[PDB]
Specification:
part of a larger assembly; 5 chains; A mainly beta; B mainly beta; C alpha+beta; D mainly alpha; A: mainly beta; globular; B: mainly beta; Elongation Factor Tu (Ef-tu), domain 3; 6-stranded antiparallel β-sheet; 12% helix; elongated
């Protein structure tokens, strides 16, 4: 059901999906980085459709340590940000998680 | 097998054919024995200089009226 | 299902080989896990 | 028809595997004489007279020259079935239905980046009309 | 067994060798030009490997009159020049051939 990474060049990652599963433009995809100190989950935004079920994406965290053929899961929606009154007085990264109190945004209303 | 394939490829009065032409340059197929910067001649009495010799075609600059050149002409 | 899953079942360190080199760049073929 | 299709499928395998020959023969000439020269050199030991006579026939590139051997072999084997047209067609659409309904099996069937012998074994073990299965194995 | 010339574009020449017989970088290769009054032995230097046993070379003499398919022999060493106290007094070209006395320096120590 999910896709896999085909090509990597700097911040740009090409992914391939099963025949019907190809995600829309501006969906958030996930991929896993597994090496040591660089180990993180990577979030990855769809920029283009290249034909033949290929999709070209732009990475949010650095791609260092990513490997060809790793699984990629389509989240089915765009990148989402916590919005609400309790957002005031906190510091967020681009992806909407709080730097001064980790996990803080997980229970808010999220918008595209 | 590969030695019989190489022996055959060596076995090839030779005439080429223009495969592309434009603006004062033309590409020739064939001529497996042409020297680099050999002077070619084309059917309209037009000459050319074999500058670039690729694996499968020869790139010739044209001297004089390149208007007389078209694809499928012979060259010698 | 069954016959395909059995055909998938029936299908050290990694070695690659240099396929191009020049000017301080080299292209390597293989290394599916790099 | 069956003998000739096997000769055309096997020479197509020699053409896709012998890449240096493929990239040298895929070039047009002012006469047939060299084209027949390699044809007499290499076709004589392992191919039938009809297959060689057909192969003795200019293509734009190597991929199209290779495809044209498969196309003749498909025509031959289908003419061999016709010499059962409804049963081969219906079975062949039905195999297309099985392949398009199972996207992991269709992707696993994409075997040009894999050993083709193990691919043909896997398909013959997964897959009825004998000639439809022959076209699929071809 | 030895290599063949396969492309020529000005002073750059591509040469194809047998699978295992590919020269290192900066080796000197000889090639023959045999037209007529223009005839000479070329020296080529290896500058790149292009893959599939093919190497790209730079010509130390005008390639004018070189024809596709000629045999090229790998000398197995880089371009070499004569060195010694007997080098003083004389005039050399790049290849270490003396212009004042054509046979001179042939018997001196050759450095790469």
């Amino acid at each position: 059901t999910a896709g896999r990474v085909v090509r990597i060049t700097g911040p740009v990652v090409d992914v391939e999906f099963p025949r019907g599963s190809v995600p829309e433009l501006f969906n958030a995809l996930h991929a896993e980085i597994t090496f040591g100190a660089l180990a993180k989950t990577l979030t990855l935004e769809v920029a283009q459709h290249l034909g033949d079920s290929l999709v070209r994406c732009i990475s949010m965290q650095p791609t260092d340590g990513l490997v060809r053929g790793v699984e990629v899961t389509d989240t089915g929606a765009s990148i989402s940000v916590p919005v609400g009154d309790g957002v005031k007085g906190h510091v967020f990264n681009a992806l909407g998680d709080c730097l001064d109190d980790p996990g803080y945004g997980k229970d808010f209303e999220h918008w595209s | 097998i590969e030695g019989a394939i190489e022996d055959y490829v060596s076995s090839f009065e030779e005439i080429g054919t223009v495969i592309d032409a434009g603006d004062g340059i033309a590409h020739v197929e064939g001529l497996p024995s042409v020297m680099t910067q050999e002077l070619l001649e084309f059917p309209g009495g037009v000459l050319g200089v074999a500058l670039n010799l690729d694996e499968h075609s020869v790139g010739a600059v044209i001297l004089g009226e390149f208007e007389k050149i078209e694809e499928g002409q012979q060259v010698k | 299902x069954x016959x395909x899953x059995x055909x998938x079942x029936x299908x050290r360190e990694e070695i690659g080989t240099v396929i191009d080199a020049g000017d301080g760049i080299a292209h390597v073929e293989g290394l599916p896990s790099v | 028809l069956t003998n000739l299709a096997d000769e055309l499928a096997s020479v197509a395998k020699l053409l896709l595997s012998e890449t240096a020959l493929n990239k040298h023969l895929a070039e047009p000439t002012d006469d047939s004489a060299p084209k027949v020269r390699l044809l007499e050199r290499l076709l004589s030991d392992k191919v039938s007279a009809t297959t060689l006579d057909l192969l003795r026939t200019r293509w734009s590139t190597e991929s199209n020259l290779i495809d044209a051997v498969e196309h003749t072999a498909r025509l031959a084997l289908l003419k061999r079935a016709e010499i059962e047209v409804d049963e081969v067609e219906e079975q062949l659409f039905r195999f297309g239905r099985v392949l398009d309904a199972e996207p992991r099996l269709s992707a696993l069937l994409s075997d040009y980046t894999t050993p083709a012998e193990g691919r043909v074994a896997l398909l013959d073990k997964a897959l009825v009309n004998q000639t439809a299965a022959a076209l699929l194995s071809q």
